[PDB]
Amino acid sequence: PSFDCGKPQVEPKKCPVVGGCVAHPHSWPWQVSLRTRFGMHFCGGTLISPEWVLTAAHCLEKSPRPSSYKVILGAHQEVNLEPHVQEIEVSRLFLEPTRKDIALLKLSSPAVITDKVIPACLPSPNYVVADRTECFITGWGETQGTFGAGLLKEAQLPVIENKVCNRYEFLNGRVQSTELCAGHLAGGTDSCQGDSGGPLVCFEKDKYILQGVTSWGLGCARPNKPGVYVRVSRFVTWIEGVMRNN
Numbered sequence: 001p002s003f004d005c006g007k008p009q010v011e012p013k014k015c016p017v018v019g020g021c022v023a024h025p026h027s028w029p030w031q032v033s034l035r036t037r038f039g040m041h042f043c044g045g046t047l048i049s050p051e052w053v054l055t056a057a058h059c060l061e062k063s064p065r066p067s068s069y070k071v072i073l074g075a076h077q078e079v080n081l082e083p084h085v086q087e088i089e090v091s092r093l094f095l096e097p098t099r100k101d102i103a104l105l106k107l108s109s110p111a112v113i114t115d116k117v118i119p120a121c122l123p124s125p126n127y128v129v130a131d132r133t134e135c136f137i138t139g140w141g142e143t144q145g146t147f148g149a150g151l152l153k154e155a156q157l158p159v160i161e162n163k164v165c166n167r168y169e170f171l172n173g174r175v176q177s178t179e180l181c182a183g184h185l186a187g188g189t190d191s192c193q194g195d196s197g198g199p200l201v202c203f204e205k206d207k208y209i210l211q212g213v214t215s216w217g218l219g220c221a222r223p224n225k226p227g228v229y230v231r232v233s234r235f236v237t238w239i240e241g242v243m244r245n246n
């Protein structure tokens with residue numbers, strides 16, 4: 001075996017995706033790659049239970065056919081998948097009903113939970129991540145010359161409270177209460193194209209809690225332009241309801 005959610009079996013680097021670093025392999029064991037039937041990566045996701053993956057709804061808007069998608073679990077290299085990697089076809093799609101940028105994928109079979117494939121923990125309903133909390137984003141997205149293309153990367157980003165993120169100098173009112181902001185004022189470190197749908201996790205005493213789903217930004221890693229994430233805590237009741245009833 002039993003593995004606790006949110007507790008990697010390979011301790012992450014937590015280096016203080018553009019910028020950041022290449023992760024230690026299998027140190028973010030909930031990170032998944034959402035792929036076409038031909039195995040091409042197009043989005044991230046987070047394993048939240050053996051049969052359930054949380055991702056961005058925009059990753060699924062082109063096809064309502066679960067057979068258009070497969071989930072890659074336990075990976076480090078994008079291209080040359082490791083022998084233990086699990087490739088599981090999606091069975092059903094559940095888009096958030098108020099059309100927010102979050103969705104669930106039910107897997108056609110449960111993922112086998114191992115020291116390299118472990119779900120993230122969900123937050124408590126309506127939890128608010130406080131300003132300046134240190135969190136991490138992971139993914140196989142663009143690197144903008146910061147090295148590590150093709151390998152799972154991580155970046156440490158502080159949360160910026162919405163009232164600050166919405167100032168003119170930053171995102172000028174765009175951020176909704178069901179979203180959160182994270183990034184460095186000076187830029188240089190951020191999630192980027194190919195990271196959407198992936199996790200934003202924040203360490204709480206002894207485990208990582210999934211607080212955000214990578215959603216959008218005004219470019220990547222620009223100064224004064226932090227990334228925007230769906231605020232997972234505002235969707236926990238809906239997520240739990242989908243899992244309970246499907």
Ligand SMILES: CCCCCCCCNC(=O)[C@H](Cc1ccc(OCc2ccncc2)cc1)NC(=O)[C@H]1CC[C@H](CN)CC1
Nearest residue numbers: 042059190191192193194195196214215216217219220227
């Ligand atoms: C020619 C089609 C191949 C596109 C695959 C490349 C995916 C790049 N992903 C994105 O641009 C997504 C949006 C996206 C676009 C198209 C997508 O669909 C492609 C697709 C093609 C074929 N089948 C399924 C999906 C999916 C997602 N946005 C992000 O990753 C955000 C960029 C800004 C960051 C700011 N911090 C936050 C992350």
